[PDB]
Amino acid sequence: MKAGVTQTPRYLIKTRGQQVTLSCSPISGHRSVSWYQQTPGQGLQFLFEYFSETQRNKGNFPGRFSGRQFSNSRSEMNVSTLELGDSALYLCASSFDSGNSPLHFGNGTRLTVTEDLNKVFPPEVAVFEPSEAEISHTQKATLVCLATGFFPDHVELSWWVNGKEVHSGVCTDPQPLKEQPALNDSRYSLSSRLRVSATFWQNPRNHFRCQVQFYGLSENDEWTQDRAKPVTQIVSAEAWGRAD
Amino acid sequence: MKQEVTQIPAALSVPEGENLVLNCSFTDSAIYNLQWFRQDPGKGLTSLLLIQSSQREQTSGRLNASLDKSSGRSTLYIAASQPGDSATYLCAVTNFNKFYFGSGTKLNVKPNIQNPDPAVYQLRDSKSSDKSVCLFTDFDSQTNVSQSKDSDVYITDKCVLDMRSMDFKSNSAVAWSNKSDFACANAFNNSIIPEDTFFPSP
């Protein structure tokens, strides 16, 4: 399998006034690299496009948003003097030719700008085992995973059954719910379900794990709070099947 | 002149199997291409169609899009919709020295539940959590799940899971709280739920 567009890093948490530099590598053979900012409020907005090491086109961002392209077509963008409203998904797209050929997007770098690193919390994660009544009525068994109390929304939740990653029988909420909807610093919650047959749940050898990867602070961020530094980490919960 | 890209509807919810129409318009007809994309939650964009300024239409699979450059319009037709079409659909145009995206159509294609069996179950507490958790499941896709009256009762929206090797799909919503005056019997009282919903004894 050949690589698609790659972007590095995937997640960043910064405070106001800091700067970030983001990288993107195009698909092999693509020479046009474009950057876009996606926010909930302004949608996708064009930053700039590079080809053969020079900027070809630019949007309407102020000069604290900058870019560049190296001779192997890799591109960087930089944002200085970060503001809360700079929190966004920073998307790169490569193309053979943006005038007549499709844009191929990366998955983005997620940036959150916060007032204070003391706003950052990892998720608490718990699994809730199936109802007996569900099992008797349907011959199916639904496990629920909750990931709660996290900020920012930099989480990836996945289910593993006997060590293998499952997608059949799963549904994870597309967006989290704000625990306190009116506040800009509100912590988040996310739910997910995994449904199996009653027979599979009833085998005590079957092992179920809900995994949440949280992308948090850097080792270079200072931390002076009593609570554990909210670094990048996995928080997990598990269950085993049960005959009765 | 200033380019403005408009998309309607902003949101579309339809039963699976139905054909869909996604509208895009642009005020400045001097474009080099128009492109349609989908975006899934937590992902970047995938290119679906690119229509050159000299072209009137493009097709791929169940997707067909027209371009009427002088009218400032494109329409995306999605035949025979599937659950896996659910996504945000974005229209973009390339102008001489700028690029512009519409605000999107958020499409939800709902599964047809062949044997609804609406119920509200209580999940077991976790020994490592303080929450009480309730599951409303197995209802028809016409059921709408509302938020709670209460600010410390959390309710998610319906989510469809597919048990592939059983040919079985189901909707569910989760409710939870750590308040003590909270019961699964009451958890979904602010939703209009089916009158035959099964409420097992606790």
Numbering used by the authors:
A (entry chain B): 1 to 244
B (entry chain A): 1 to 15, 17 to 203
From the paper:
The key molecular interface that enables T-cells to sense these threats is mediated by the clonally expressed T cell receptor (TCR) that classically distinguishes between self and foreign peptides. The TCR governs T-cell specificity by discriminating between self and foreign peptides presented by MHC molecules. One key feature that is likely to facilitate this level of cross-reactivity is flexibility within the TCR complementarity-determining region loops (CDR loops) that form the antigen contact zone. The finger-like CDR loops of the TCR are thought to meld around specific pMHCs, sampling the peptide cargo, and enabling T-cell triggering by ligands with sufficient affinity/dwell-time.
We generated 12 structures of the F11 TCR, that recognizes a peptide from the influenza hemagglutinin protein (PKYVKQNTLKLAT) presented by HLA-DR*0101 (DR1-PKY), between 1.58 and 1.89 Å resolutions; 5 structures of the DR1-PKY specific HA1.7 TCR, between 2.31 and 2.98 Å resolution; and five structures of the 003 TCR, that recognizes an HIV-GAG-derived peptide (SLYNTVATL) presented by HLA-A*0201 (A2-SLY), between 1.26 and 1.37 Å resolution. Indeed, the CDR loops of the third TCR included in our study, the 003 TCR, were superimposable in all the structures solved. The 003 TCR structures, which exhibited practically identical CDR coordinates, were solved at an average resolution of 1.31 Å. Finally, none of the 003 TCR CDR loops, which were identical in each structure, made any potentially stabilizing crystal lattice contacts. However, we observed several CDR loop re-organizations between structures for the HA1.7 and F11 TCRs, while all structures of the 003 TCR were identical at the level of the Cα backbone. In order to determine the appropriate Ecut for TCRs, we performed rigidity analysis using the 003 TCR at cutoffs of −2 kcal/mol and −3 kcal/mol (data not shown). Analysis at a cutoff of −3 kcal/mol, but not −2 kcal/mol, demonstrated that the structure was largely flexible, with very few large rigid clusters. Although this analysis is an approximation and should be treated as such, the average maximal loop motion was slightly less (6.4 Å) for the 003 TCR compared to F11 (8.7 Å) and HA1.7 (9.0 Å), consistent with the structural data demonstrating greater rigidity in the 003 TCR. On average, the 003 TCR CDR loops moved slightly less compared to the F11 and HA1.7 TCR CDR loops, in line with the structural analysis.
